[PDB]
Design a protein around this ligand. Structure first.
Ligand SMILES: CCn1c(=O)c2c(c3ccc(C)nc31)O[C@@](C)(C/C=N/O)C[C@H]2C=C(C)C
Ligand SMILES: CCn1c(=O)c2c(c3ccc(C)nc31)O[C@@](C)(C/C=N/O)C[C@H]2C=C(C)C
Ligand SMILES: [Mg+2]
Ligand SMILES: [Mg+2]
Ligand SMILES: [Zn+2]
Ligand SMILES: [Zn+2]
Lengths: 323, 323
């Protein structure tokens, strides 16, 4: 009866999980069911003494603060970034290299990293003197808000899934989550990438193949770029998944650019439904953002990202052929 | 008494203005009367078409949101930092350097830079899981809040003192104000001081002897350090002023320390009234913070600030002599 959903969830460790089906089958609860699954799969419930009712309560409360009428930045994208991060943590070239806490931080960060997203960009909120941009002084406006909401919901009744962490564990986790989610701001992508390249060229490895990071500065930079890769992972997924992500982001962009066209603002790139090319935008997005980032990641974890980089370059070739 | 206040306000261009008298003589409105005086002095009402009653209404509303029951971080501190910034802007070595808009930004930023300060530090708000730390993700918690409140109050009835700036002017002013107030976070002090050192070491000057500032980065960095110097200027003031500031910061610190000892927290440095040394903390404050900063600033504007640095060194010696 649920074995449909339970059998899809069987793919939780595979790139290209059937996240849109899992959303439909779970009762529009992909974030809740996928997080629940991923915690079991790595046994985080018993490693950190999380009451299961408390996990589900938090997850469902969290998922509820993702906007169902926002086409891209909703609970499905959160579920997909969670699950993506989860695979990238299990890559050979990085195994047993992060704590149970650093693992908990990256996955919790992925889950909350877009919560309460209103469907419009940081630049839109800035230009419209929004209450959000006023609160956060125009700097990483959305990303600060996702964090603040993600942490605030822990205080709702029976939602504190970190109640049995030590207090310095809670402090360490809190800081890592903030560093990670703030890194999802696209205005930080360029410097985040140069730092990733830097680490790649001066990289160090073991005999079995596993990577050598000695200080927090470098390890959080990897977890940052990791969740950042998961956030920009849509063009690396199988094409039938990627295409649905393209429909959704463009719906959201167009729904934004309409509001910029009433208000009389410059319509943002790719948001003018009357002049944009959906396909050319994907090729540029791949050429200039996704492929530079994922090529560098693939080096860092070489061999491990080749099947992912493979799919990305196929998907790029296909989108180009539609032009 | 209005006569007497008006006489005291003739000293607005002088270091060591008696701000505490002006607080009494103005009916606890030092920030309003000093800001009004300064705007008249620099002719800012005409330059930016600021209606006088709009200015007064904003200043009065902003002053209200400083806590009258907080011994140091109140409207008197705000007026002192405004006035200190006003004098520092008038230094010969900077004549004709900054536009009217940059002058406006620095004075406005000084005015709002501590608004709604609750009398406890950033670390205290972080460690006690405050609503403020939660909103701002433990990063420049107060300084972000001071900015949010200061800009927010412009939208109250008849409070938008910037209503006649161009759009470009408001956008540029807003960014500068944020850059300046975020620089008052003491966690930024070392890097800001290191930058000011470098600038002094590589300093360039026009044929006029005035400091040469090519680009936003150098311009905003000087304005950042200027307001930061004014923020840390109490030990450079005549001793009867300095000593009352010491009484006020130590009272405010001790009360935070009481809250800390109550909660079973470690007491912050200088906040333990059973074990604090008021005199040694002022010597350590000067030696490790205020003199390294003011010595570098004096070098930047040499010789303009020699008398101010002499005073700091005399006051340092005086506090030292009391040990
Ligand atoms: C249409 C192309 N495109 C994007 O332009 C962006 C995508 C994105 C995600 C998926 C797809 C299919 N397409 C995307 O994502 C960003 C908004 C980041 C998303 N965060 O949730 C980053 C954004 C990129 C910028 C503003 C340079
Ligand atoms: C007791 C010595 N002392 C300080 O320690 C500090 C003062 C300060 C201001 C005046 C006097 C007399 N004394 C001060 O100011 C800061 C809190 C900044 C003030 N912002 O309003 C910075 C703070 C310094 C830190 C946390 C290293
Ligand atoms: Mg985001
Ligand atoms: Mg301050
Ligand atoms: Zn995202
Ligand atoms: Zn201050």
């Amino acid at each position: 009866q649920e074995d449909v959903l339970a059998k899809e969830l069987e793919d939780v460790n595979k790139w290209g999980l059937h996240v849109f089906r899992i959303a439909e089958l779970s009762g529009n609860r992909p974030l809740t069911v996928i997080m629940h699954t991923i915690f079991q799969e790595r046994d985080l419930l018993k490693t950190f003494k999380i009451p299961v009712d408390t996990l589900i309560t938090y997850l469902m409360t969290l998922e509820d603060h993702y906007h169902a009428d926002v086409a891209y930045h909703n609970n499905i994208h959160a579920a997909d970034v969670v699950q993506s991060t989860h695979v990238l943590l299990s890559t050979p070239a990085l195994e047993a290299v992060f704590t149970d806490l650093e693992i908990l931080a990256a996955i919790f960060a992925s889950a909350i990293h877009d919560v309460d997203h209103p469907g419009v960009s940081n630049q839109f909120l800035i230009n419209t003197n929004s209450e959000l941009a006023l609160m956060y002084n125009d700097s990483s406006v959305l990303e600060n808000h996702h964090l603040a909401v993600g942490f605030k919901l822990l205080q709702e009744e029976n939602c504190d899934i970190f109640q049995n962490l030590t207090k310095k564990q809670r402090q360490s986790l809190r800081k890592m989550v903030i560093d990670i989610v703030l890194a999802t701001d696209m205005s930080k992508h360029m410097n985040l990438l140069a730092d990733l390249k830097t680490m790649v060229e001066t990289k160090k490895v073991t005999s079995s193949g596993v990577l050598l990071l000695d200080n927090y500065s470098d390890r959080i930079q990897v977890l940052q770029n990791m969740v950042h890769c998961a956030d920009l992972s849509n063009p690396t997924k199988p094409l039938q998944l990627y295409r649905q992500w393209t429909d959704r982001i463009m719906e959201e962009f167009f729904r934004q650019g309409d509001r910029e066209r009433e208000r009389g603002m410059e319509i943002s790139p790719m948001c003018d439904k009357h002049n944009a090319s959906v396909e050319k935008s994907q090729v540029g997005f791949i050429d200039y953002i996704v492929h530079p980032l994922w090529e560098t990641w693939a080096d860092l974890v070489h061999p491990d990202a080749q099947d992912i980089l493979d799919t990305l370059e196929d998907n790029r070739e296909w989108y180009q052929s539609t032009i």
